[PDB]
C-alpha cells in the first residue's frame, strides 16, 4: 500500500527503477506483495539461508538432449463452426460430416475450473517455492492405508506430481516431480537455482526434481526412475497416444497380480507420475495453443483415452480425477449423437466409426441416459463381424475400432438396470462367436510378448465361461522360441480379465440367466432371437427341454437347455434328456439363408467347446459351407446347430 524505488549498481551504472504498488496491487488481483515479502525471510542471515539451500536434493545427472514437440492438435479444418464450451447451442453442428471444433479459450476454463493451492507450505516445498495458488486439476490416489499417497497437481502450464510415504511413525518422506515448459516453471524462492534441480531439459521443456537429501535417499530404496526415458515419452508423444501408453501399462498390470495388493516398486511409482502427465499433456496442449479452436475429431480421440484411463485408475487405486472434464464437450458430443443412425453406424467409414464411438462415450458418460448408443456399438460389431473372416484373429485395424465401441457397452453392464437388453445381448452373442480358438491363440501370444493384442479382445465381454487355466494352455502358441513362463503369465492374466465373479462385466444382466440353478457350471449361453440356450454341465437347468450330447466319459457332462422367449420352467424337466439328431440329408451349398438366426457350435469331446458361429447373413453362411470349416473326418469333433426352433442338431455329412 505504497510505492517503492529500487536503486542498484550495474557494473558502474547508478540505475534506479520505481515499482508502483498503487498500480500493480489493484491492476493484478492475485498480487499481494506483503505475503511475498513475508515468504522470503528477508532478514534471514546468510547462515540459515545457506542451511535451507543445502537440504534440497540437487541434480547430478542433469542433462537431456533436445527432443522435438509432436504436432498434436491439428489446424482448423477450413470453415469449422468454432464453438463455445459454455454456450453449447442446439443444432450448431449438423452432422458427423460437418467440420466442428470447440474454441480453446473457454474450454481451458472448463477443464481447469477447480482452484486450490499448487505449491503447498508443506515442509519440502515452502523452503524452495514462493507459494502459489492457481487454477488447477489433480490426479490423486492413496494406498497402503493412506500411508503412501501420490498427487498429480497440474495447471495449463506445468505439472507437479508429489509422492508421500509414512514410515509407520510420524515421519513423512516427500518427493515431487515438476514437469512443463522451461519458461512456465514456477517462481523460485530462496537462493535456489533451477538447473540444480533440473534432471532433463530439451528445447522448451524441463523436468525438475524437488526433495530433501534425506528424502531422496529414503525413496532411492524402491524408486529409481529412468528419468531420461520418462521425459522423452512425456515430450515426444502425442497427448492421445501418451494416454494409451499409460492405459496399456495399467490394463496389462490390472488383470495380472499387480494392483490388487500394489507393489511399491520403481515401475508402479513411475506409472503414477505418467498418469498425471497423460491428463496434463491434454490440458497443456489445449492451453498452450492460444486463442484458437481444437478440432473436435482430436477432442473425441484424446478425451476418449482419458475417459478409459479415468475408469481403470478408479479400479486399480482409490483414485480421483478432479478438473479435466468440460460439460461443454460432453453436451457437444451428445448432441452430435442425435445426428446419426445408430442402427446403421457400422455401414460408415473406418475413420467415421471411430470418431462416432468416441463421441458416444464422451457424450453421456455415466452410460444409461439414452440407451440407443448401445445399438450403435452393436452395429459396428455386426458390420465388422460379417466382413471379418470369422474365427480369425482380428487385425489391429478392426480390433482398435471394436475396442472403442466396447467401452459404451461395458458401462451398461456396470448398471443394475437393463437399459434395453436386446442390443446388449446381441453384442455379447457376436462377441461369443468371435471368441474362437485362434482369437485366444493370438491374444495369448500377444500377452506373452506384451503386444497390442494384450489390451482387448471381444472375448472379454462374451458369454463364454468354459475358460479356465487348463483350457487356455492347450490353445496357446506352440513355439519353443516363446518363454513358456510368459505363456503361463499370459494364461493367468487372461483368466484374471474374465473371472465370472468379482468382475461384474461378464454376467447378471440377461433375462434368461434366472433359469439356472448352479451358475458356476454353465459353460456358455447362446441368446438367439425367440430363444436362448444354456450350455452347461449342470443337469438341473430349468429350461424348455434338455439335450445331452454324446460327450465322453471324460468331461463332466454336456447339456443344452433351450429357454423359449426367456421364460423359465417351474422345475428342471425330469427323465432322460433328448438325443441330438444326426443329419446328412443336407446339401453343402445354399443360395438362401436357411441358417439365418441360428447358432453353430464346434466342440471337441475331451477339450470342450472350440468355436461358436452366429449365422447372421448370407455371406456368413456361404463363408461357412464353402470354407474348410466342416471336417467330419475328425470324429473327436462334432458340429451342433442351435435353432430358433429350440432344437439342437448335429451335422454329420454334406453332399
Amino acid at each position, epitope marked *: 500500500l505504497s510505492e517503492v524505488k529500487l536503486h542498484l549498481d550495474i557494473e558502474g551504472h547508478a540505475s534506479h527503477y520505481t515499482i508502483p504498488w498503487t498500480e500493480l496491487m489493484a491492476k493484478v488481483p492475485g498480487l499481494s506483495p506483503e505475503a511475498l515479502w513475508r515468504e522470503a525471510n528477508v532478514t534471514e542471515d546468510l547462515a540459515s539461508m545457506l542451511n535451507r539451500y543445502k537440504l534440497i536434493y540437487k541434480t547430478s545427472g542433469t542433462l537431456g538432449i533436445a527432443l522435438a514437440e509432436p504436432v498434436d492438435i491439428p489446424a482448423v*479444418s477450413e470453415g469449422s463452426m468454432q464453438v463455445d464450451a459454455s454456450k453449447v447451442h442446439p443444432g450448431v453442428i449438423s452432422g458427423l460430416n460437418s467440420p466442428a471444433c470447440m474454441l480453446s479459450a473457454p474450454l481451458e476454463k472448463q477443464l481447469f475450473y477447480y482452484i486450490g493451492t499448487m505449491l503447498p507450505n508443506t515442509r519440502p516445498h515452502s523452503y524452495v517455492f514462493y507459494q502459489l495458488r492457481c487454477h488447477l486439476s489433480y490426479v490423486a490416489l492413496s494406498i497402503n492405508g493412506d500411508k503412501f499417497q501420490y498427487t498429480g497437481a497440474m495447471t495449463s502450464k506445468f505439472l507437479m506430481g508429489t509422492y508421500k510415504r509414512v514410515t509407520e511413525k510420524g515421519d513423512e518422506h516427500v518427493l515431487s516431480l515438476i514437469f512443463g515448459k522451461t519458461k512456465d516453471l514456477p517462481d523460485l524462492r530462496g537462493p535456489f537455482s533451477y538447473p540444480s534441480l533440473t534432471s532433463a531439459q530439451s528445447g522448451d521443456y524441463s523436468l525438475v526434481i524437488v526433495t530433501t537429501f534425506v528424502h531422496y535417499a529414503n525413496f532411492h530404496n524402491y524408486f529409481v526412475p529412468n528419468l531420461k526415458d520418462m521425459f522423452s515419452r512425456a515430450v515426444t508423444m502425442t497427448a492421445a497416444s501418451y494416454a494409451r501408453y499409460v492405459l496399456q501399462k495399467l490394463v496389462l498390470l490390472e488383470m495380472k497380480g499387480g494392483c490388487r495388493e500394489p507393489e511399491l516398486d520403481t515401475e508402479t511409482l513411475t506409472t503414477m507420475f505418467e498418469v498425471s502427465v497423460a491428463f496434463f499433456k491434454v490440458g497443456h496442449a489445449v492451453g498452450e*495453443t492460444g486463442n484458437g479452436c481444437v478440432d473436435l475429431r482430436w477432442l473425441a480421440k484424446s478425451f476418449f483415452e482419458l475417459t478409459v484411463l479415468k475408469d481403470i485408475i478408479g479400479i486399480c487405486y482409490g483414485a480421483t480425477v478432479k478438473g479435466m472434464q468440460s460439460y461443454g464437450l460432453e453436451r457437444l458430443a451428445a448432441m452430435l449423437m442425435a445426428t446419426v443412425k445408430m442402427e446403421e453406424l457400422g455401414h460408415l467409414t473406418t475413420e467415421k466409426q471411430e470418431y462416432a464411438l468416441r463421441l458416444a462415450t464422451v457424450g453421456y458418460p455415466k452410460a444409461g441416459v439414452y440407451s440407443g448408443l448401445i445399438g450403435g456399438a452393436t452395429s459396428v460389431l455386426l458390420s465388422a463381424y460379417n466382413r471379418h473372416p470369422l474365427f480369425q484373429p482380428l487385425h489391429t485395424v478392426m480390433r482398435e475400432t471394436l475396442f472403442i465401441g466396447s467401452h459404451v457397452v461395458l458401462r451398461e453392464l456396470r448398471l443394475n438396470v437393463t437399459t434395453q437388453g436386446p442390443n446388449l445381448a446381441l453384442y455379447q452373442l457376436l462377441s461369443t462367436a468371435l471368441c474362437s480358438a485362434l482369437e485366444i491363440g493370438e491374444v495369448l501370444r500377444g500377452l506373452a510378448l506384451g503386444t497390442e493384442s494384450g489390451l482387448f479382445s471381444p472375448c472379454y465381454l462374451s458369454l463364454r465361461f468354459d475358460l479356465t487355466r487348463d483350457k487356455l494352455l492347450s490353445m496357446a502358441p506352440q513355439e519353443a522360441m516363446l518363454d513358456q513362463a510368459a505363456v503361463s503369465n499370459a494364461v493367468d492374466g487372461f483368466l484374471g480379465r474374465l473371472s465370472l465373479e468379482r468382475e461384474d462385466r461378464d454376467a447378471w444382466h440377461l433375462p434368461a440367466y434366472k433359469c439356472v440353478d448352479r451358475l458356476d457350471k454353465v459353460l456358455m449361453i447362446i441368446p438367439l432371437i425367440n430363444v436362448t440356450f444354456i450350455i452347461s454341465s449342470d443337469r438341473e437347468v430349468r429350461g424348455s427341454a434338455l439335450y445331452e450330447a454324446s460327450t465322453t466319459y471324460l468331461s463332466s457332462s454336456l447339456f443344452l437347455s433351450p429357454v423359449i422367449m426367456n421364460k423359465c420352467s417351474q422345475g428342471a424337466v425330469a427323465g432322460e434328456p433328448r438325443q441330438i439328431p444326426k443329419i446328412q440329408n443336407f446339401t453343402r451349398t445354399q443360395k438362401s439363408c436357411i441358417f439365418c438366426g441360428f447358432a453353430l457350435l464346434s466342440y471337441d469331446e475331451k477339450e470342450g467347446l472350440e468355436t461358436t458361429t452366429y449365422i447372421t447373413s448370407q455371406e456368413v453362411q456361404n463363408s461357412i459351407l464353402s470354407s474348410n470349416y466342416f471336417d467330419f473326418d475328425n470324429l473327436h469333433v462334432h458340429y451342433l446347430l442351435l435353432t430358433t426352433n429350440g432344437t439342437v442338431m448335429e451335422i454329420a455329412g454334406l453332399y
Partner: T-cell receptor
Amino acid sequence: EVQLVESGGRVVQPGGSLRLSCVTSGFTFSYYPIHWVRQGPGKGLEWVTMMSFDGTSDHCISSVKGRFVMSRDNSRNTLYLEMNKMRLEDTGVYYCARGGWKWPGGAFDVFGPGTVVTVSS
Amino acid sequence: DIVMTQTPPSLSASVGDRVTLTCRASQAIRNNLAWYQHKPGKAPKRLIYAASTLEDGVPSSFSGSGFGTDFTLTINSLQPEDFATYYCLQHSTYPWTFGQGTKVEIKR
C-alpha cells in the same frame, strides 16, 4: 503479456512504396497467422489483408489486391508488409493482429499500437 | 463482399444505462462475428468473439448474442471508460468487413 508492435510508419508520395514491420513478442509466432486492419481519417476500421500461417498464400481485399505483398520470417518473429501504388484513400493508421491460432480459421485479438501512413506528396 | 450494417451510427446515454448495439449481415455468417472497442489514439480491444463469448479481461457487463443474420452487443451497465466507438466484425467469408461502427457519446 502478448505484445504486437508495428513500426513502419512514414510519409509516402502517392504511388510510391512503403514497407511495414509488425514485431510480435510474448507468444509462439509461427503457430499464428496475421491480419492487417486500417482506419482512415474520419472513417471506420477496414480489414485490409491476411497473412497465412505458411505465408505462401496472401489474400487481400479488392481495393488493395495485387498491390500488397506480405512476407513473414518466423525466426525474426516479424511480419513485413510491402505496399505498392499507394493511393490517397490508403492513407490512415494501420494495425496488425494475430488471427488463426493453429491457423486457418481466423479472428483478431488485441492489435498493436498502429503506425501512421500519410499518402500526400 | 458481405455488408455489415450496424445500427445506430451514433448513440448517447448516461453512466449506468443499458446500451444495446445492433449489427446485421447481408448473408448468413453463421456464428463468426466479433466486437471491438476502439478508443481514439490507442489500440482496439476485442470484446466478444463467437458473437457470444465474452473474452478474458473484459468486464462482464458486456454480452453478445445472435445467429446467422442479426447480432447484438449489449453493455448492461455503462461505465465512464466505456465511452468509445464500437465496431462489429464478420470473419465468415473473406474479404472480411467491419460495420461502420457505433460511437457511444455520453449524454448531456
